[PDB]
Design a protein around this ligand. Sequence first.
Ligand SMILES: CCOc1ccc2nc(S(N)(=O)=O)sc2c1
Ligand SMILES: CCOc1ccc2nc(S(N)(=O)=O)sc2c1
Ligand SMILES: [Cl-]
Ligand SMILES: [Cl-]
Ligand SMILES: [Zn+2]
Ligand SMILES: [Zn+2]
Lengths: 212, 223
Amino acid sequence: KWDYKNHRWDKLHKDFEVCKSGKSQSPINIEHYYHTQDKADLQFKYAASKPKAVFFHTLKASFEPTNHINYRGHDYVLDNVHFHAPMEFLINNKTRPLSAHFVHKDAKGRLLVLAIGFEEGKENPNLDPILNFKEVALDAFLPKSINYYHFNGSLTAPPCTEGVAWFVIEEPLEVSAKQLAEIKKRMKNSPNQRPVQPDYNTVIIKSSAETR
Amino acid sequence: KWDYKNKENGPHRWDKLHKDFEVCKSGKSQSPINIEHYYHTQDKADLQFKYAASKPKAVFFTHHTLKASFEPTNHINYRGHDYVLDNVHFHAPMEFLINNKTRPLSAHFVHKDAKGRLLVLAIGFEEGKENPNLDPILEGIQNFKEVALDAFLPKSINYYHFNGSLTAPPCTEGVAWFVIEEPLEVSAKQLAEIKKRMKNSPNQRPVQPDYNTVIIKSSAETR
Ligand SMILES: CCOc1ccc2nc(S(N)(=O)=O)sc2c1
Ligand SMILES: CCOc1ccc2nc(S(N)(=O)=O)sc2c1
Ligand SMILES: [Cl-]
Ligand SMILES: [Cl-]
Ligand SMILES: [Zn+2]
Ligand SMILES: [Zn+2]
């Protein structure tokens, strides 16, 4: 059984062999990239939303097909949000104590994932509805203006399927220290961060968008 | 047994011939593709060429292409990492399609660095003027005369850069592609001969599935 306990994922199932063999496995440290000033091309179609279900090695909140992201002429339906502690993706070796992943699928079956860091500070109201289920302020969840990193990668969890479009947001969200240990407690006080995977000089663009 | 013919050994079946080749199917950054969506970028000038005229170690037909091997004298520098041009080979038509445009021919500059990491540079050809750069080879397949590598490429190039795979089995990924937009020119006769030297047998992998590849457009000076 696969866990984060103390590189052998490929062994447990042959379905997981790509975890080693893939040349574009995630997460990574974002250190070399291209600046661009091209249109967002990223449109959010988010609303405050109450979960299809809320359940637990990571804390996950799933949703109905109500929230969308449209990228270069294709609609990606929001499936779920889950957390990693520490932040899996590194930005020039800076990681945040917590992260969230927003998972999407298009007509063609393609995957798009949204990642953002958290900053230890003020209480974050967006977390509480989940922590009948209370609705989550998605369209308000995200920063107004985001600087993001976009590149190609894999699932950070098995089967580590690749073909994932990652957009990693620069801005850290804020989380209070009680909330942090609580979710950390919520995840059995067991870390669920895959280490940085081998990076074969991934082509990375830095760009921005308006989430709302 | 892989080939480009429509029988059991074509591209739609390359994954079946050897288990070493399955990434041809399962791989998620498979090349070639149609380059139409990309990001325009600051021209930080990432790529530096260091080519000289060079005589081929060998010029020979292998695995459907005309290949010219070289001593490790011609190089490319990318973000402070140097890749040695290993060989130049040909595909007809051009395999990468640029904004849905297909060219009669392309040339691939295969580079490998110390780590065994791969870099390939592609430039297309369309029918026109006689190319003196080409002729050493068409005769050389039949010592070898040197190739004006330093003179081969356009002075300033527009190219697309992304991560992809090899276009022939084993279809290895982690390949850094530099696809130059500018077409070089070839005479209609030279064109017909290259195809004859490459046996009038197509050696173009079809466009492969695209998983939203991040492509940047930039430019450089080859001279
Ligand atoms: C039905 C199985 O769905 C799975 C399994 C692993 C997995 N990892 C992500 S992530 N952390 O965004 O890269 S999403 C996902 C979905
Ligand atoms: C080890 C044998 O060398 C091989 C096998 C396939 C292959 N495809 C290219 S290409 N068409 O530039 O992407 S180069 C190359 C070298
Ligand atoms: Cl993350
Ligand atoms: Cl090509
Ligand atoms: Zn995740
Ligand atoms: Zn080739």
